[PDB]
Design a protein around this ligand. Structure first.
Ligand SMILES: O=C(O)Cc1ccc2c(c1O)C(=O)c1c(O)cccc1C2=O
Lengths: 112, 112
């Protein structure tokens, strides 16, 4: 969604510490893989954008949800998200467990 | 811009450590209060979205830029960026210097 689209009521920013650029590509390819297309149909899901830190040490997902309830239950209570969490945690090259920060969009500076 | 727009070539995620929600509010109000009106017109600037972390301890800015070069030339090398940083670091309740992470968008999942 646009960054200031009013449907975004909740955001998660999830950082995955990795050992280098190869694992950054391998981690992204696993989270955007084709078998994860069920996420697209989760109610309240707006987007998940994976990035590779320029220094090669991390993968960061900026994810847009309609609400904290959509993330925690619609997504979080589905068995598939536990499945996905395990697979991401077992990938070789990870340096530690992912760390998420939860937040609410409060203001945006945009070009006219 | 849409989070997956191909024009987004460079992203900075900037975290400001604060002492609680009242300061989170004031820092977002400062950031969108007119101090960075000038940024809107800068070539390559796509957006800056300020969020309040739900735990009350930080304000995070997810900024989209057309490329790393436009960011360095049009924001980093412009002395008004130091002006901006002086303004945001002047607020009472700001507990440390901002931390930034530079990255490039690599994959995204959008609804369907
Ligand atoms: O829970 C953690 O602590 C780590 C963690 C691992 C994988 C995922 C998440 C996550 O948070 C997400 O948030 C997440 C999201 O918001 C939107 C889409 C996908 C994921 C996702 O695949």
């Amino acid at each position: 969604a646009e960054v200031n689209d009013p449907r975004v009521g909740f955001v998660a920013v999830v950082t995955f510490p990795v050992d280098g650029p190869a694992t950054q590509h391998k981690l992204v390819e696993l989270a955007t893989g084709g078998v994860q297309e069920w996420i697209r149909e989760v109610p309240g899901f707006l987007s998940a954008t994976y990035h590779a830190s320029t220094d090669g040490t991390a993968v960061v997902n900026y994810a847009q949800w309609e609400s904290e309830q959509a993330y925690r239950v619609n997504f979080g209570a589905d068995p598939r998200s536990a499945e996905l969490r395990e697979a991401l945690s077992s990938l070789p090259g990870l340096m530690g467990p992912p760390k998420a920060v939860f937040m609410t969009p409060r203001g945006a500076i945009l070009p006219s």
